[PDB]
């Protein structure tokens, strides 16, 4: 019973929620770049997409949203979307690398 959000406990809401367009978990796609979480529980996250062309990306970044904002002590919500380096489509798992071609 407490009231200091951290990584883990953000990694372990995120690993619900599912990037559609490719079937998987953000933390099993390894999108987050970094996860630092003020103890004002300022939830503050370095992440991105593959891909700018993702389908329904407002969707699927709200649904992020849903599963960060429930971690019950989640002040505030600083999903940063750094949408200029390259990701790495190896993150995913190693049979998903062999399924999708990487």
Same mark, same amino acid.
């Given at each position: 019973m407490s009231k200091k959000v951290t !990584? =883990?406990?953000v990694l372990n809401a995120l690993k619900n929620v599912i990037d559609f367009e490719l079937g998987l @978990? &953000? &933390? +099993?796609?390894g999108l987050v770049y @970094?996860?630092?979480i003020d103890?004002? $529980? $300022? &939830? !503050?996250?370095?992440?991105?997409?593959?891909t700018p062309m993702c389908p329904l990306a407002g969707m699927i970044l709200s649904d992020a949203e849903e599963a960060i904002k429930k971690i019950e002590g989640v002040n505030n919500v600083e999903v940063e979307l750094t949408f200029d380096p390259p990701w790495t489509? =190896?993150?995913? +798992?190693p049979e998903l690398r062999e399924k999708f071609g990487v």
């Open positions: !990584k =883990e406990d @978990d &953000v &933390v +099993s796609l @970094d996860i630092q103890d004002q $529980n $300022n &939830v !503050k996250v370095l992440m991105t997409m593959t489509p =190896e993150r995913m +798992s």
